Amino acid sequence: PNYALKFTLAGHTKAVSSVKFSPNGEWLASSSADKLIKIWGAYDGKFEKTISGHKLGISDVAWSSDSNLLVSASDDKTLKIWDVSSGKCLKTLKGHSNYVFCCNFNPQSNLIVSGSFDESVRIWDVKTGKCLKTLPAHSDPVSAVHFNRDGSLIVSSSYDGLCRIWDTASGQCLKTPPVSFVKFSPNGKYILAATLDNTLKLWDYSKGKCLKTYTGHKNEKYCIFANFSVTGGKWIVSGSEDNLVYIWNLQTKEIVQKLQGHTDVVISTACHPTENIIASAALENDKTIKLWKSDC
Ligand SMILES: CCn1cc(-c2cc(Cn3ccnc3C)cc3c2CCc2c-3nnn2Cc2ccc(F)c(C)c2)c(C(F)(F)F)n1
């Protein structure tokens, strides 16, 4: 690939914590320690709106499948569901007893999953805003939560060193160095897992075996989002503590590009759902989001 900087998105006044493309490809949402959500054009980075209401900083945000709703996870111990068009907070999800770190809708988008410093994973009904289940998932803060492609499975990770797979319907555990990030692959068959020893691993979840290992980046301190890029060449994409975006060939594990431009830890990356476009965001020395485009 030949990802090249096209736009730099400024506006947040503290570290940016997460960026996510809307499933319809129109928008990029960002969250920040500055308690704000910002929406930007996905293709030209054009600032669209600020969404406000959380009383403390935000760690994560995620889109509904129809791109109409956002959910945000905050240090104020709540999640908020937002109508993106109006910017209004529709529901406040109350129940966690510590910071909410990570969140995601299921594909049907009737449910939200959340992970917290209170070591629990919670499952929420989008329409009532009520907590359906509280999973005693981990013995340390939960670093990632993600649904598989039909919402039947939740994968979670934690600084307790574990990755667990949960049955959404029953909340019961199906299968079991800090694990700083996990997420299901685009075909459902794999889980990509980060550990705080500068290592990413591709796991066959059905077989329970590590298939590929990716190294070269720096990751000993922060939970950093990683991604599958599927619109062109099949890559793994991750931020890094040396301020670079790393892009590996999924099959060969070779680094194929390093994106230079940020001036702090690249805490979050995201891949556009249909075009060869990457968003990246960095910590407090930088506070900008960068949009990179590749011809392949
Ligand atoms: C509330 C405002 N806010 C949150 C963050 C933030 C964002 C992300 C990116 N992220 C978010 C969700 N999923 C991912 C990959 C990661 C971190 C942080 C700040 C805290 C943190 C992060 N990684 N490690 N720690 C210390 C730590 C120690 C023990 C633990 F068990 C755990 C779990 C963490 C930020 C900032 F962007 F500034 F970092 N601001």
Author numbering: 33 to 208, 215 to 334
Sentences from the paper on this structure:
Genetic and pharmacological evidence suggests that the nuclear scaffolding protein WD-repeat containing protein 5 (WDR5) is a therapeutic vulnerability of the CSC population. Previously reported WDR5 WIN-site inhibitors contain a tri-substituted amide core with an Arg-mimicking “S2” group, which penetrates to the bottom of the WD40-domain central cavity, and two additional “S4” and “S7” substituents that make interactions with pockets along the surface of WDR5 (chemical structures in **[Fig fig1]**, binding pose in **[Fig fig1]**). Herein, we report the structure-guided development of a novel series of triazole-based WDR5 WIN-site inhibitors designed to increase passive brain penetration. Herein, we describe a small series of WDR5 inhibitors containing a tricyclic triazole as a core amide isostere. These triazole-based inhibitors potently inhibit WDR5, maintain a conserved binding mode in the WIN-site, exhibit passive permeability, and, in some cases, improve brain penetration.
We prepared analogs with two distinct S4 groups: a low molecular weight cyclopropyl (**C3TD343**, K_i_ = 5.9 nM) and an elaborated trifluoromethyl pyrazole (**C3TD078**, K_i_ = 0.030 nM, **[Fig fig1]**). As expected, the congener **C3TD078** was found to be more potent, with an equivalent K_i_ to the comparator **C16** (**[Fig fig1]**). The triazole analogs **C3TD343** and **C3TD078** were found to have favorable permeability (MDCK P_app_ > 2) and measurable free fraction of ∼2%. Representative data for a potent compound (**C3TD078**, K_d_ = 2 nM) and a weak compound (**C3TD343**, K_d_ = 200 nM) are provided in **[Fig fig4]**. We also deployed the CETSA in washout experiments to establish the profoundly long off-rate of **C3TD078**, which remained bound to WDR5 for at least 21 hours following compound removal (**[Fig fig4]**). Across both cell lines and all five genes, the average IC_50_ = 80 nM for **C3TD078**-induced transcriptional downregulation, which closely matches reported IC_50_ values for **C16**’s transcriptional activity in MLLr leukemia cells. Taken together, these RT-qPCR data align with the CETSA and support potent on-target inhibition of WDR5 by triazole-based WIN-site inhibitors in CSCs. We observed that **C3TD078** dose-dependently and significantly decreased the stem-cell frequency of DI318 and L0 CSCs, but only modestly—200 nM of **C3TD078** resulted in a halving of the number of stem cells (**[Fig fig5]**). We also characterized the potent but only peripherally bioavailable triazole **C3TD078** in proliferation assays and a flank xenograft, but we consistently observed unremarkable CSC killing. Our work emphasizes a considerable challenge for the field: WDR5 inhibitors must have exquisitely potent direct affinity to have any functional effects in cells. For example, **C3TD078^’^**s potency right-shifts from biochemical TR-FRET K_i_ = 30 pM, to cellular CETSA K_d_ = 1.6 nM, to functional RT-qPCR IC_50_ = 80 nM.
